[PDB]
Structure 1
């Protein structure tokens, strides 16, 4: 509360460390469904159904331009990528499996780096 603060967690490396995680996600072999925004002209149903599209390139541009206020808003956009994928893709499809694999990969790096 006013003039009563928990001890200051060192957040000065967060930007660099989110960048490193994001590099590891970009270079994973199963990243291909997520590298670029879904083409809303060419994929029927996507525009109407997925209210907030997100992809790794969009996250990379937001990261690079100071549009994440803190590491939690960064994790929210990564998770959005996988939540969108589960909304639109069957679990038993290549893209559906890719999304589960990537979410797992991300969540481990996140825990190991920050928890």
Structure 2
């Protein structure tokens, strides 16, 4: 509270670390469904069903332009990518499996990079 400060983690490396994690996402072989925005004019249903589309290139633009206030907002967007993928795609599909794979890959790097 007022004049009662909680000690807080050093966040000065966060931007560089998130960029590093995102680069590893982008270069993963199963990254292909998520590299660009889904084409809302070519994929029936997508615009109406998925209220907040997100993809790596959009995350990369936001990261590069100071649009994430903190590392949690960055992680919300990354997870949004895989949550959208699960909403729209069957688990037993190439894209669907790609998403499950990429989520697992992200979550480990996230724990390995930040959680002590």
Q: TM-score, normalised by structure 2?
A: 0.98
- The ranges of structure 1 where at least 4 consecutive aligned residues each deviate by more than 2 angstroms after the TM superposition are none
In structure 2, the partner of 1:104 is 104
Where in structure 1 are there 5+ consecutive unaligned residues? Answer: none
Offset at residue 8 of structure 1 (A): 2.9
Q: Per residue, is there more helix in 1 or in 2?
A: 2
CA shift digits 1:45-89 (9 cap, x unpaired)? 000000000000000000000000000000000000000000000
Whole-Å separation in 2 of the counterparts to 1:8 and 1:86: 35
Whole-Å separation in 1 of the counterparts to 2:2 and 2:114: 27
The number of equivalent residue pairs is 115
Q: TM-score, normalised by structure 1?
A: 0.99
Matched, 1:15 2:8: no
Whole-Å separation in 2 of the counterparts to 1:78 and 1:8: 24
CA RMSD of aligned residues (A): 0.4
Where in structure 2 are there 5+ consecutive unaligned residues? Answer: none
